[PDB]
Design a protein around this ligand. Structure first.
Ligand SMILES: Nc1ncnc2c1ncn2[C@@H]1O[C@H](COP(=O)(O)OP(=O)(O)OP(=O)(O)O)[C@@H](O)[C@H]1O
Lengths: 370, 377, 51, 248, 556
């Protein structure tokens, strides 16, 4: 019953987050500012302090600025805040990014370090040198003269846990991690969707070191095929904007991109090129040694009988994925609970593998033929 | 559980700390004058009349307003076809308004210079030479063209396999252009409102016309509706109008005049026929996969920064790369350094590159690069 | 209403004159609410299912 | 993609047209055989039974190829007629040259080489017929064989090709006993396997065709059981099921 | 495997029972959860139960031999007699050589060379006598360092240059001295010490001691280089150099006190003040008396200027110091009398705990420290001194009660005595620093913010600490800006490039430049080495005091 202490820790943390004016100067600004303030674009700057401000209603009247903290921050395209009635610039421009971009930023990673992953050690080495190592020890890259690889693609069959490597990177990253699916750019309006790709990157540059994960990239960029029927996907325009951000004039500053696809052949050649994906990581279906580590990790936090033979299940059946191993472990526990045994027998594991692998039918008469 | 208790105790201590912690003349006289000061909404004049001027102005979406000039204004200063500010309460042009800058178009102009020399681009002397006389020599020395009475092409299309160097050359031209360089954001041209983007393209040319001799880089031309299926569904109708507006402004009824257009496309076939037609873009400078002399030069430029033994043979490494784009050759150099970092050797050796050459080309699923077939030797 | 109570993507009520936060209003959901189909739960059939 | 020509090889080294033909054999009447000590047997399902059809022809899926050999055909009807003729021709051609009945494995290898050739040459489609061979030869004794459209062949103590082959093979593997088949027991195994594989209820005599090859007095005596002989075997299987009742 | 054995831990009855039945498993249950119990005593379990575990762990380990692991419990126990019994077992089996060489660093504040003679009665190979004394701790360091790299003026290069402008000219030479293991700092330049002035001149002369961490004969060579120095600042630094010559000397230390030592405000007396800290560098703890007699008249003199008393307090905090729980040091006993003597002199209030608190450090329950604190209570500057002593007196273990007590007192709006309390929080916890993040932005105390950067304390080099210093790199207060580079230096012990470039850009003032040099000064867990952070509680010290503050040294 140590769970109560853990539950208390979670509740206390929420309370801490919940618990996270000048005598005359502030009161004067409070009087100056309207109870409702409307934020609008700045179109023109005039030295008299009366500067044209664009608004949804398009009233662009030159309006005086009296900002106590600072009025030197005014810039073209800045979103100024104006009084609802007078429309004068109230003060320092509002500085918040679009709401859809805010959702991507991730502050908490549920998984821990690379320890949960087993047998993808070569894959771990590549992700670390591209992502974790340059930040931890920048001097090595400068001495070599190499500029650190900034882009990685993880391509593998279903259930090889490409996402698990990404979750592990989130657990130990100085860089802010923005997690965006490739299928999250379906903006119906013409435009907007390519602009959203620009928005994600501008935020990444604002947060300085940043890691971008784009799971299921197949949806955003595939083939770059012609309009054909004339429906015109506009997705190709969205992919072209991403292609521009990764290496299309200017620079990407310090932003690293991790992308994951079940199928890499479909992805258009331009996106999967050096300069957009300098390093490519391949997740193969687990073999035998990799399977042993995964089977141990999944069964590490469960009751295990001496009778169970982990090696027998791994060697007898070949083709099961890392996810399939976890499913066998969950199914085996349920099989034991049916007999009301918390402890898991070897028999339970044998029954479990059969139930999980019933949808996987492969091969035709290619037996006698060769 | 005791260790978990220690963290819970730490959280409780933080909670106690938070609760225990709990237990310019502009804002002065100027505000009193500022609140009375009235507003003047911007509007655009279209006409003027004799005697009482009765200038009629469209606000921007409201109505044609027959507004008389304000008492404290000069009638000559107010002009037909001039932006003006009209007070709503007094219904008169209190002060004239300066012409709209249209900043988003101004933003696309490069302004800054990318720090890449033509020297860094390698293995494409012919492609560089073709760009030089449509971009630098006609502008820098127009006299030579005039002597033969030959006009410059005034248009260039860079097309090639991805990673060839088309954009790298373009940034190099920007470094030494000595004339306005206008990189165009393809997504910006597409806009929510119908033909709103087409209005921007007119502005793009207008800005180009105001500056004397400027080069406009339409990178990713495919983004700017570079196709004209124009099917009955007309899903791309708004973009198709934007593309046609670019084509007419580019050429026909007086063309660029002093504007040189550089357009770069990974897929040239997709581009619409009217844009491909010359006059709009006279030159067709296709970039090509580098030859062995080019492959050695790209390796040498990329590896000059890296610390390596002086005896390495780039010619062997380039030969081992049968058909490699410049980006892949750069990928070999960076990968070779990464192998040396893995073994912690500060100075890399020829072997490191060979391992990288296998990794960058053969290890990738090229299939042709990796040989299991005895077939040919 | 506390500032803490306010959250992103929450449908609050803005006062007619001063746009003040009058109250927090729930049911901030798109047409997918009809798809829930939780209401009018289907006729009980666990016994009616056969072999 | 890599279909059409038997000649094209898929990037995974797979001849799809040959594979498609081997899969196609499934849409055919069930044919099964048991090696049987002191005998050998071939059993087939007579599909497409109708009141008007005469069935005057002796047999329909069972064809003798020699004095001491026979085959059952499952596949495209026209291709079967072509192959049966060639198999009959090869058998007599060997007798003419060597004056001895062709060894059973050789007749099978020869047709299989012809079937194999069709796959290697562009112009023709791979044969859609698979067949089972029953015969006695002095060199290796009673034998049973299977041929595939791919041209591969094998010798099986028991095997099935048409319709639900996997169901018969699973039933045969458990029921069959090595060295104890004893012909009459093998006939019973066939009737029981046939009942399971055929969706037909009661396994009526018209639906089943049984051919048994035995060596009597030094001479092979291939015989196709008459309907009355087939009926008694069916009644015995039904009676055995009645004995199984209550105990099961 | 001891999973259900830990259940009987609460009854200590468990300690005696655990030794009674522990036989088959050399480690296993003895390690793991029982070792985790030792780790938990460091993490959550209270100090009195922790002391009982240390004896229990020693008892199980003694059956399994392995004297060095038993020694680690004994140093944590802080019981010299128990440690001596283990030393007799470690002397019995000769690894004994590693045990002694590591012992000089491993030994707690209980003894410095006292541990060297703890098992000396047998003497035998004379291991520990030389191994646990400064004789073997740094004798192979110079050859071992030579194999890895060659010491030189590389950090004096332009990338590592700390600039001049007088204030940073002294800092630049001292920063080069930190790189000095490396013995040419005085040789570098012509009269580099002459370029150094006042407090900086003391630092350059001190660099002779820094130049040789070990070697009495080499240090005498340093003494000849600046023998009978003409300027008082050179003379004071040379006496300090005699102190820094060795972790322990037994030779130069006796003359260093004898030289000068006027015992009243005077030139010779101020010149001796350097030697007083240098003799302090030799030892640490609470209750030793080997060289106490030499330093006894210095605090007894109680000169009105804090300079004699403060160096004497620093000296006593690290001179006559051995036993745990604090002690009645004859000078510390009269230090309280000197503290009672001065109603004013706020410098005394900060400096007196440098000795009293250091004695009260390396303590367990510290009830004796509380009794000394009752004598200390009086006027508010003395009350602040009492708080600083109490902060050092806190156990420094898993107990959160002491931390919560400082936290509640710190929350009070007046923080004059609570300035160092935030630093004390770090001293107590050395395991899971979940509570290490401090909501300094929520705190409105300028003083609280000033010590906030120091509150992170010494670190291996983790980036999280660097990020906090960078965020607070340019706070409005100069003191706030000054603290972040010293704190960055503590973590330093990019890797260092990002701080050097950022500090230079943000700085541009002389004040800003010097703090930046201090972070680059350190560009390239021991009970005895728990001395420098305590030695610089307030970076509020003026530039002359900061030059005196350069004396801090101990970590490898
Ligand atoms: N000839 C070359 N010389 C030097 N670097 C080159 C060359 N070709 C390619 N590169 C390298 O490849 C990248 C330049 O790619 P660039 O900006 O030209 O876009 P691109 O990939 O050719 O364009 P697109 O994606 O539209 O096909 C840089 O990393 C650059 O160093």
């Amino acid at each position: 019953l140590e769970r109560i202490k853990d539950y208390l820790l979670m509740e206390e943390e929420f309370i801490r987050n919940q618990e996270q004016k000048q005598e005359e100067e502030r009161s004067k600004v409070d009087d100056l500012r309207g109870t409702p303030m409307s934020v609008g674009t700045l179109e023109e700057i005039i030295d008299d302090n009366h500067a044209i401000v664009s608004t949804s209603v398009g009233s662009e009247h030159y309006v005086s600025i009296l900002s106590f903290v600072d009025k030197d921050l005014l810039e073209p395209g800045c979103s100024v805040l104006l009084n609802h009635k007078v429309h004068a610039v109230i003060g320092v421009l509002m500085d918040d990014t679009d709401p859809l971009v805010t959702v991507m930023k991730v502050e908490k990673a549920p998984q821990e370090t690379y320890a949960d992953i087993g047998g993808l050690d070569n894959q771990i080495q590549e992700i670390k040198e591209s992502v974790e190592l340059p930040l931890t020890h920048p001097e090595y890259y400068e001495e070599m003269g190499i500029k650190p690889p900034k882009g990685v693609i993880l391509y593998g069959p279903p259930g090889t846990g490409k996402t698990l490597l990404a979750k592990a990177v989130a657990n130990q990253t100085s860089a802010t991690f923005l997690r965006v699916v490739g299928s999250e750019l379906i903006q119906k309006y013409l435009g907007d969707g390519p602009k959203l790709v620009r928005e994600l990157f501008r935020v990444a540059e604002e947060h300085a070191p940043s890691i971008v994960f784009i799971d299921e990239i197949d949806a955003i960029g595939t083939k770059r095929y012609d309009s054909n029927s004339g429906g015109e996907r506009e997705i190709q325009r969205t992919m072209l904007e991403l292609l521009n951000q990764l290496d299309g004039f200017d620079s990407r500053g310090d932003v690293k991109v991790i992308m994951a696809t079940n199928r890499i052949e479909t992805l258009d050649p331009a996106l999967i090129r050096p300069g957009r994906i300098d390093r490519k990581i391949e997740f193969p279906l687990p073999d035998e040694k990799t399977k042993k580590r995964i089977f141990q990790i999944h069964t590490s936090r469960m009751t295990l009988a001496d009778d169970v033979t982990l090696d027998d299940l791994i060697m007898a059946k070949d083709d099961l994925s890392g996810a399939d191993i976890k499913a066998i472990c969950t199914e085996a526990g349920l099989m034991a609970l049916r007999e009301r045994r918390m402890k898991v027998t070897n028999e339970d594991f044998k029954k479990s593998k059969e139930n999980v692998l019933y949808k996987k039918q492969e091969g035709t008469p290619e037996g006698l033929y060769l | 559980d005791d260790i978990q208790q220690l963290l819970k105790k730490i959280n409780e201590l933080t909670g106690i700390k938070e609760s225990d912690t709990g237990l310019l003349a502009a804002d002065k006289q100027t505000l009193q004058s500022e609140q009375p000061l009235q507003v003047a909404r911007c509007t655009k004049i279209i006409n003027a009349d004799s005697e009482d001027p009765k200038y009629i102005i469209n606000v921007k979406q409201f109505a044609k307003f027959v507004v008389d000039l304000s008492d404290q204004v000069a009638p000559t200063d107010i002009e037909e076809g001039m932006r003006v500010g009209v007070d709503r309460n007094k219904y008169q042009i209190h002060i004239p308004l300066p012409p709209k800058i249209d900043p988003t178009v101004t933003m696309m102009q490069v302004e800054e210079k990318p720090d890449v020399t033509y020297s860094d681009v390698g293995g494409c002397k012919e492609q560089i030479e073709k760009l030089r006389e449509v971009v630098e020599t006609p502008l820098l020395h127009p006299e030579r063209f005039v002597n033969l009475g030959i006009e410059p092409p005034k248009g260039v299309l860079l097309f090639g396999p991805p990673g060839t160097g088309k954009t790298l050359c373009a940034r190099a031209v920007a470094n030494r252009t000595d004339a306005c360089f206008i990189r165009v954001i393809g997504s910006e041209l597409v806009q929510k409102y119908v033909g709103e983007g087409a209005r921007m393209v007119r502005e793009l040319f207008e800005m180009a016309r105001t500056k004397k001799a400027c080069l406009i880089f339409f990178d990713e031309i495919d983004a700017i509706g570079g196709a004209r299926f124009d099917d009955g569904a007309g899903g791309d109708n708004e973009v198709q109008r934007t593309m046609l507006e670019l084509i007419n402004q580019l050429d026909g009824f007086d063309p660029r005049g002093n504007i040189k257009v550089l357009m770069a496309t990974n897929r040239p076939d997709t581009l619409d026929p009217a844009l491909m037609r010359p006059g709009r873009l006279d030159r067709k400078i296709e970039f090509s996969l580098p030859d062995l002399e080019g492959r050695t030069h790209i390796f040498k430029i990329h590896a000059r920064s890296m610390s390596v033994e002086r005896d390495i043979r780039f010619e062997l490494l380039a030969r081992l790369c049968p058909n490699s784009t410049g980006a892949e050759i750069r990928s070999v150099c960076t990968e070779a350094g990464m192998f040396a970092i893995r073994a912690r050797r500060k100075i890399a050796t020829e072997k490191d590159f060979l391992e990288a050459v296998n990794k960058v080309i053969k290890s990738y699923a090229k299939f042709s690069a990796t040989p299991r077939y005895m077939t040919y030797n | 209403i506390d500032i803490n109570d306010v959250t992103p993507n929450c449908r609050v009520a803005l006062r007619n004159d001063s746009y003040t936060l009058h109250k927090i209003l729930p049911n901030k959901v798109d047409p997918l609410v009809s798809l829930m189909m939780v209401e009018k739960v289907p006729d009980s059939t666990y016994e009616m299912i056969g072999g | 993609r890599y279909d059409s020509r038997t000649t094209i090889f898929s990037p995974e080294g797979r001849l799809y047209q040959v594979e498609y033909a081997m899969e196609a054999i499934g849409h055919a009447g069930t044919c099964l055989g048991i090696l049987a000590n002191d005998g050998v047997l071939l059993a087939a399902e007579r599909r497409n039974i109708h009141k008007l059809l005469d069935e005057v022809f002796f047999s329909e899926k069972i064809y003798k190829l020699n004095e001491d050999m026979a085959c059952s055909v499952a596949g495209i009807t026209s291709d079967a007629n072509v192959l049966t003729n060639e198999l009959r021709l090869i058998a007599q051609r060997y007798l003419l040259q060597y004056q001895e009945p062709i060894p059973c494995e050789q007749l099978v290898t020869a047709l299989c080489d012809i079937k194999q050739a069709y796959t290697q040459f562009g112009g023709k489609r791979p044969f859609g017929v698979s067949l089972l061979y029953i015969g006695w030869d002095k060199h290796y004794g009673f034998q049973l064989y299977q041929s595939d459209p791919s041209g591969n062949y094998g010798g099986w103590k028991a095997t099935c090709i048409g319709n639900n082959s996997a169901a018969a093979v699973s039933m045969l593997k458990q029921d069959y006993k090595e060295g104890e088949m004893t012909l009459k027991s093998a006939l019973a195994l066939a009737i029981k396997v046939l009942n399971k594989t055929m969706d037909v209820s009661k396994l009526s005599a018209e639906k089943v065709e049984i051919a048994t090859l035995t060596r009597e007095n030094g001479k092979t005596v291939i015989r196709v059981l008459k309907q009355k002989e087939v009926e008694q075997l069916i009644k015995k299987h039904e009676e055995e099921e009645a004995k199984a009742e209550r105990e099961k | 495997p001891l999973l259900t054995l830990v259940k009987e831990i609460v009854p200590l009855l468990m300690e005696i029972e655990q030794v009674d039945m522990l036989e088959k498993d050399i480690d296993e249950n003895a390690y793991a959860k029982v070792c985790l119990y030792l780790t938990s005593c460091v993490n959550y379990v209270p100090e009195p139960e922790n002391s009982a575990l240390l004896r229990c762990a020693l008892g199980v380990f003694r059956k399994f031999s392995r004297f060095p692991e038993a020694l680690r419990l004994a140093l944590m126990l802080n019981d010299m007699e128990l440690v001596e019994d283990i030393f007799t077992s470690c002397k019995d089996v000769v690894m004994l050589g590693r045990h002694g060489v590591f012992l000089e660093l491993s030994e707690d504040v209980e003894e410095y060379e006292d541990l060297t003679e703890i098992m000396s009665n047998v003497q035998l190979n004379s291991n520990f006598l030389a191994l646990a004394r400064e004789l073997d701790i740094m004798e192979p360091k110079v050859p071992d360092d030579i194999y890895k790299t060659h010491l030189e003026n590389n950090r004096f290069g332009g990338s590592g240059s700390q600039v001049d402008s007088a204030r940073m000219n002294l800092a630049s030479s001292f920063v080069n001295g930190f790189v000095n293991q490396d013995k040419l700092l005085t040789d570098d330049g012509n009269k580099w010490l002459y370029k150094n002035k006042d407090h900086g001149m003391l630092s350059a002369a001190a660099s002779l001691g820094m130049i040789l961490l070990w070697d009495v004969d080499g240090g005498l060579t340093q003494i000849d280089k600046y023998l009978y120095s003409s300027e008082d600042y050179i003379k004071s630094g040379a006496l300090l150099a005699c102190g820094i010559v060795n972790s322990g000397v037994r030779n130069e230390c006796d003359p260093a006190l004898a030289l000068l030592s006027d015992y009243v405000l005077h030139n010779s007396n101020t010149m001796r003040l350097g030697s007083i800290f240098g003799l302090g560098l030799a030892y640490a703890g609470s209750n030793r008396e080997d060289v106490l007699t030499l330093l006894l008249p210095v605090m007894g003199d109680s000169k009105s200027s804090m300079e004699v008393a403060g160096v004497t307090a620093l000296a006593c905090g690290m001179i006559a110091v051995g036993s745990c729980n604090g002690d009645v040091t004859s000078t510390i006993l009269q230090t309280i009398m000197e503290k009672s003597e001065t109603e004013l002199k706020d410098t005394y209030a900060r400096w007196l705990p440098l000795g009293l608190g250091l004695n009260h450090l390396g303590k367990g329950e510290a009830i004796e420290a509380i009794l000394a604190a009752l004598e200390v209570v009086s006027e508010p500057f003395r009350s602040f001194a009492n708080t600083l002593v109490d902060v050092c007196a806190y156990a420094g273990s898993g107990n959160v009660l002491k931390v919560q007590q400082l936290l509640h007192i710190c929350s009070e709006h007046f923080d004059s005595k609570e300035k160092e309390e935030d630093k004390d929080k770090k001293e107590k916890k050395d395991k899971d620093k979940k509570e290490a993040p401090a909501d300094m932005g929520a705190h409105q105390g300028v003083a609280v913010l000033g010590i906030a950067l120091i509150a992170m304390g010494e670190e291996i080099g983790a980036e999280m600490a660097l990020r906090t210093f960078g965020h607070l790199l340019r706070y409005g207060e100069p003191t706030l800006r000054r603290a972040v580079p010293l704190a960055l230096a503590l973590i330093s012990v990019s890797h260092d490039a990002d701080p050097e470039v950022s500090y230079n850009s943000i700085f541009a003032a002389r004040l800003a430049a010097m703090l930046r040099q201090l972070a680059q000064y350190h560009a390239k867990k021991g009970t005895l080495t728990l001395c420098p952070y305590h030695s610089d509680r307030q970076l509020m010290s003026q530039v002359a005091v900061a030059g005196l503050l350069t004396v801090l040294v101990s970590f490898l």
